[PDB]
Structures are given as C-alpha cells and as structure tokens.
From a paper:
Accordingly, we generated the E275K substitution and the resulting trimer, BG505 SOSIP.v4.1 GT1.1, referred to as GT1.1, was expressed successfully in mammalian cells. Thus, GT1.1 priming followed by boosting with BG505 SOSIP or ConM SOSIP selected for at least two different CD4bs-specificities, both of which have the ability to accommodate the N276 glycan and neutralize diverse HIV-1 strains.
Overall, the crystal structure of 21N13 in complex with BG505 SOSIP was in agreement with the cryo-EM structure in complex with GT1.1 and we did not observe substantive changes in Ab orientation or epitope when comparing the two structures or the bound versus unliganded 21N13.
Residue numbers in the entry:
A (entry chain L): 1 to 213
B (entry chain B): 1 to 100, 100A, 100B, 100C, 100D, 100E, 100F, 100G, ...
The structure:
C-alpha cells in the first residue's frame, strides 16, 4: 500500500532537451521500481526495471537512477517518438502500485485549429443513420473543446471524439468529432453547428450548415 | 459411459390413449433413473425420480416402473397439454447420461400449411433494415421445410424460424420464417420467395412478390 507521486504531472520540451521525471514513494521500495511508456490506445511498454536496467530494445538515451524513496527517469536527448505518458511502478510487496503518470510531448508555438464540418452523405442517409463530422486540424496544445448545436440547442451524449498522436513533423494534433443521429431525428432539424474553443483562438469558432441547403 | 436408448423416438396419440415409453440402458442402472418433460424453448421439468416416485404437482396419469436395464414411463390417459419431449436420465455413478428423448404430441389428420409472404413495411425500410416474413399457418405434422430464394438464389444463414406450441383446439402448428437483410442488399434484388415442403402438399408451394410491385 505504498503511495507513489510523480513530478511533474505534465511536461513539454524540445527535441534534444534533457528530461528528468521524479518518482517518490511513501516508503522505501529497495530499488524495486520500474518505468513504463504508454502511447494512446496502447498498453504500457516497459522501459526500465530494477531502477536502472534497460529493457531489451530500449534506446540508451533512457536511464534510471535512485534509491530508497527517490527515483529518477532521465531522457538525455528528447526525440519526437518519446511522447506519451510515463509511469513508475514498485513491486516491493503487494499491492503493486503505479504512479499517477507524467505526460510528455514536443513543445512548439500555439497553433489554432482549422475547423471543418461535414454533412452526412446521401449514401448514409439511405441506411437510416446520419453522422455529422467536425474536424479540428493541426492544432497545439492538445487541450481542445468541441460542442455540437442542433438548431442552437446544445447536444450531449450523442457524439464521440478521436485524436491523432502528435505529428512527427509539425508537432500538432488533429481531432474529429462525430455527431450520430437517426435519420428521423436528423430530418426534423435544420441548422447543424460545431463550436470549437482552443487557447489559440481569440474567440470560439463555429462551423455550421443548413440541412438541404 | 452408460448408454441409454429411448423408444420410440417420436410418438403421436389421441387424447385418452395409453402411452408407453421405454428407456433401455446398456448396463445395470440400479433404479437410479429419472424422467423429465421438456416443453419447446423451456428447461426440462422433473416428472419422476428414483424410477417410480412422482414429483409434487405431477398428475397421477404419469407413472414410472422398471429395474435393471429396462424402465418405462406410462401416460394412462394422454392429455393435450402432455406434448413435449420426454427424457430419461440415470445417476448410477458418473458420467450422468440422458436418453435421446421421445417427442410426444396429439395425433390428427395431416393439414397442409397455409403460406403467406409479407414484404418489409415502408416504416422499416426508412430505418435501414428489411425483414421479409413467411408464415406457415395451421399445419400438421410438425415436420416442415422453408427455403428462401432471392432472385432464384438459395439463401443461407440470414433467416430465423419460430414455432408456436401445438394448439389445444385443432392440434396444429404455426411457423414464421424471417429473412433479415440490409436495405442496400434488399434494394438490389427483385423477386423474393419462400418455398415450403410439407407432407400435406402434393408439391412444394412457393409464395413470392416483386419488390416495388
């Protein structure tokens, strides 16, 4: 029942920077500490075990040090493919415990999202369902909010979002929001709008279309 | 390990007839034999246990006898609600084994099925799915075969069937066969037919319709 605190909780640096992540345990874990890198949608990948031993196939720029209640993961030269959430984990007794995680990505200047809205196609409308797609293209940082409005009414519970991983070239993100309705519900409304808020925008951006126009 | 043979496999008698079902075992079962009644779509119901003892709530017209390898289930006066499949089961050691089962229903003259076909409704076609229904109404005996032909092509794996229990009045059965397609697959074909084979029909009967007519 050993508590584990990671610092920082979020981190952003440039390619080639030196990155240090600290893992503090409430009690001495006697070097029984492991480090993992998790990319979105994937299982955590083991980087370091037993404080300092690199796993097979892990690049040498990852190193681990520490003892007692103080442990450190170090990336000597940060690379583009090093984004994700890093976890420490102790195995000194039970229960096995993970740290809260530390999110890492490549730092760049703020880029506002470019917003596009797509009406459902006639082919899908024949199928009895209607999907309205809203695209937020090439923005940074990751934090973004998308709201759907059908005839100026805020929607809830009928949309899903998907985000791409941080691009290796421009270090931006892309996001798609899909509003799913039945054809009957889609046909009894006129205006379909997508409102986007992002710190790169001085004010929310709305893209809308009128059904059948 | 211990094999069990029931005789007969299928049985049809009139109301008030005396029905005798034989359960033969390959080895001595030592009177550790039970009898079950199973209605269609339901779990087996224990009728008699330990060769001869009736379960509470079982009418006295059911009786079980036998010893060694020969056992008998007797219905002194068959009633209409006695339809179903009857199983014997031994528990003299393991593995526990059941008999093959004996189907019982009320005897009557052969009745040919009245076949109807129903196209999918407009309300369902708007929803994006198409269900075509073929009805076999008031037939006897139970054995019947239904085949779906879409543009004269035999269909497989896209239909389900449901049967009513034997009617208390006329002792007939009714069956529905539902062919489920997507709206797209349904719209790319013209002729939809169900072909029915039954002993009451001198030749197979085909009911069909042309989509959009």
């Amino acid at each position: 029942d050993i508590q584990m605190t990671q610092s920082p909780s979020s981190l952003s640096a440039s390619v080639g920077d030196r990155v240090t992540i600290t893992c503090r345990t409430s009690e001495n874990v006697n070097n029984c500490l492991n480090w993992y890198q998790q990319k979105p949608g994937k299982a955590p990948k083991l980087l370091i075990y037993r404080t300092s031993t690199l796993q097979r196939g892990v690049p040498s720029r990852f190193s681990g040090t520490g003892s007692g209640t103080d442990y450190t993961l170090t990336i000597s030269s940060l690379q583009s493919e090093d984004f994700g959430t890093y976890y420490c984990q102790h195995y000194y007794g039970t229960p096995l415990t993970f740290g809260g995680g530390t999110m890492v990505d490549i730092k760049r200047t703020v880029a506002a999202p470019s917003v596009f809205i797509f009406p459902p196609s006639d082919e899908q409308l024949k199928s009895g369902t209607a999907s309205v797609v809203c695209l937020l293209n090439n923005f940074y940082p990751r934090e973004a909010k998308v709201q759907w409005k059908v005839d100026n009414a805020l929607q809830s519970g009928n949309s899903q979002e998907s985000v791409t991983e941080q691009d290796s070239k421009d270090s931006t993100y892309s996001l798609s929001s899909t509003l799913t309705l039945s054809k009957a519900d889609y046909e009894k409304h006129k205006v379909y709008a997508c409102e986007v808020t992002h710190q790169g925008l001085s004010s929310p951006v709305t893209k809308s279309f009128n059904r059948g126009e």
